[PDB]
């Protein structure tokens, strides 16, 4: 019965909390928050490797990806294991997040706690945007918030 | 050879960056680091069970306590599993933190990835003052600053 929650910060406008949930082992992760000061539109949403906050969202370096694989969407084969593709924030400028993962763990060798979620610029182009950044970070550009993933009560 | 990673940040000026390392599972965890911002003195420094950040300080919660046991310092027989005890602030209000523990570790089930550091505002009397308070935080005051604990390169 696990449980995380990440409070996402940069320099900019943009904020939220994301709350995670694993029923066991074996079961999907919920994650449910809601993030704000985003420009309307979809923002690539992903883990990233290290939760190393020392030079803002750059040091938490890149999508996790512990086998090795290129950029896809959450529903692809061929994915990163921290992509969770993007959320949608509205004219309001926010964003509730509702996503559910089978890929992505609160525990195991897979886990996600201790490392970073950052929303991006830019929409996440799911490694179809024809050049190599597409196949490394979907073109979502820079990091506006993040956060280190913690355990929650 | 596991390396976490932690900044501090609080509402007042308290800053800081704290550097684990562990070699082996079997092994003790070196912490070392400074922190900024404080009044001369020791200052309670201790692991604090959840990475929650949605209230502050506060919303992490008691000092992780996994074995139910009463405050005390790093030394003692009786201890909770995050009491590491006071670091030194010189005239400078700069603290450098080197401690060195083997209750703590970065993996298994005294795993402190995705819990929160925080740097208190009095000295811990180490569950020694005769009081209930001393019984569960060592009489060490507010949250000063505090900073979840990240999986680092
Ligand atoms: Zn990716
Ligand atoms: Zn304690």
Not at 33 to 39: D, S, Y
Not at 114 to 120: A, D, E, N, Q, S
Request: hydrophobic share 30%; proline share 3%; with cysteine.
């Amino acid at each position: 019965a696990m449980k995380a929650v990440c409070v996402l910060k940069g320099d900019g406008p943009v904020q939220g909390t994301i709350h995670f949930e694993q029923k066991a082992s074996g079961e999907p992760v919920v994650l449910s928050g809601q993030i704000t000061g985003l420009t309307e539109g979809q923002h690539g949403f992903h883990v990233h490797q290290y939760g190393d906050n020392t030079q803002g969202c750059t040091s938490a370096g890149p999508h996790f990806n512990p086998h090795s694989k290129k950029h896809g969407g959450p529903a692809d084969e061929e994915r990163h294991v921290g992509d969770l593709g993007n959320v949608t924030a509205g004219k309001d400028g926010v964003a509730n997040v509702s996503i559910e993962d089978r890929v992505i763990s609160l525990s195991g060798e897979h886990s996600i706690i201790g490392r970073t979620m950052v929303v991006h610029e830019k929409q996440d182009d799911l490694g179809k945007g024809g050049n190599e950044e597409s196949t490394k970070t979907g073109n979502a550009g820079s990091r506006l918030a993040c956060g280190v993933i913690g355990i929650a009560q």
